[PDB]
Design a protein around this ligand. Structure first.
Ligand code: AYR
Ligand code: NAG
Length: 343
């Protein structure tokens, strides 16, 4: 089990002003650290954040969090369930800021809610340095769904923070799961581009510096889209993305005749195209919302290679490799054309 620690700097808060936190299981002797960002959509104005507070309060507040959680999938400490990093130090960071991990704004007389996702990540890293992270060789910042987009937004800032604090030997890397979205046309027609544009203003959202300098003021929403922000990043990032992701289809208003068949096939081709120049990637031809912290994450294969194997080959590459591939993108054009897709 992973044990809850609420942040000692109680000014770094969840949406409602309660302290943010992290769950930790230490592994003495290991110099690998895995920090995982939870997902769960977002909210972008007073009215829709008020609704989220009524029926999704654990995503806005720490008041009801449990004292422990069980690590599963890539967060499991059992080699049978996690062939990749079962002996690592494990950290689960709850998503309680509703801002795709981008915010830097406190609750005040002008702000009903605090949006502090970017500061939560920084404060967790700072407090872990005194709990063993100072001795790390690799820090892998991972995350699923909104947490996967959060990895893309924050991995280079973690690297810069550790350099400025005097720890240049820790190698910072990212693993973005299910957070690589397209700003495409909907099948029928608040779209993500508009909702994110409003969210950035409401959250005081921040984006990576090189991407910000390309797109400039008013256009920072572009940096929330993986294919646009990825080429600006300096840290190594492994991208996991279903070709027919259910959250992508939801925002596209897809819930089969010729028009819809062509729409779905074109979506898969577009996603494949955006990954052509991403050297470390795993993209199966499945319709799914399943994520890498699920217990059976080992079961899916692309071209005969599982995700835990691909991640191990990635580790070796950062020391091509015979029989140890890292670029695994399906080419078949319809969901479940890969027989290993989740049931
Ligand atoms: O958190 C999510 C999905 C969140 C999607 C977040 C998101 C959607 C569109 C975007 C974006 C981020 O930036 C670029 O455009 N879940 C979906 C399925 C599993 C439950 C959680
Ligand atoms: C607490 O966090 C806030 C926001 O990141 C920061 O301004 C302040 O310096 C922090 N204080 C300490 C003692 O870490």
């Amino acid at each position: 089990d992973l044990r809850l620690h609420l942040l000692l700097n109680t000014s770094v808060t969840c949406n409602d002003g309660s302290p943010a936190g992290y769950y930790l299981k230490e592994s003495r002797g290991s110099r690998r650290w895995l920090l995982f960002l939870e997902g769960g959509w977002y909210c972008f104005n007073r009215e829709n954040c008020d609704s989220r507070y009524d029926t999704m309060r654990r995503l806005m507040s720490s008041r009801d969090w449990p004292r422990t959680r069980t690590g599963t999938g890539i967060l499991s400490s059992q080699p049978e369930e996690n062939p990749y990093w079962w002996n690592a130090n494990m950290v689960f960071i709850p998503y309680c800021s509703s801002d795709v991990w981008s915010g830097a704004s406190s609750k005040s007389e002008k702000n009903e809610y605090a949006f502090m996702g970017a500061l939560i990540i920084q404060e967790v890293v700072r407090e872990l340095l005194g709990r063993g992270l100072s001795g790390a060789k690799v820090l892998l910042l991972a995350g699923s769904s909104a947490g996967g987009t959060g990895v893309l937004l924050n991995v280079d800032r973690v690297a810069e923070q550790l350099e400025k604090l005097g720890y240049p030997a820790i190698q910072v890397r990212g693993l973005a799961d299910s957070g690589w979205f397209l700003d495409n046309k909907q099948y029928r027609h608040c779209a993500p581009t508009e909702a994110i544009r409003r969210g950035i203003r409401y959250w005081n959202g921040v984006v990576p510096e090189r991407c910000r300098r390309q797109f400039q003021e008013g256009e920072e929403w572009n940096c929330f889209f993986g294919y646009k922000v990825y080429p600006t990043l300096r840290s190594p990032v492994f991208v996991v993305q279903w070709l027919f992701d259910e959250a992508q289809l939801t925002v596209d208003n897809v819930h089969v005749q010729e028009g819809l068949r062509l729409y779905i096939q074109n979506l898969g081709r577009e996603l494949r195209h955006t990954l052509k120049d991403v050297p470390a990637s795993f993209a199966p031809a499945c319709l799914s919302h399943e994520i890498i912290i699920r217990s059976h994450w080992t079961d899916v294969q692309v071209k005969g290679t599982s995700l835990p194997r691909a991640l191990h080959c990635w580790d070796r590459s950062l020391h091509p490799l015979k029989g140890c591939p890292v670029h695994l993108v399906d080419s078949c054009p319809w969901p479940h054309c890969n027989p290993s897709c989740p049931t």
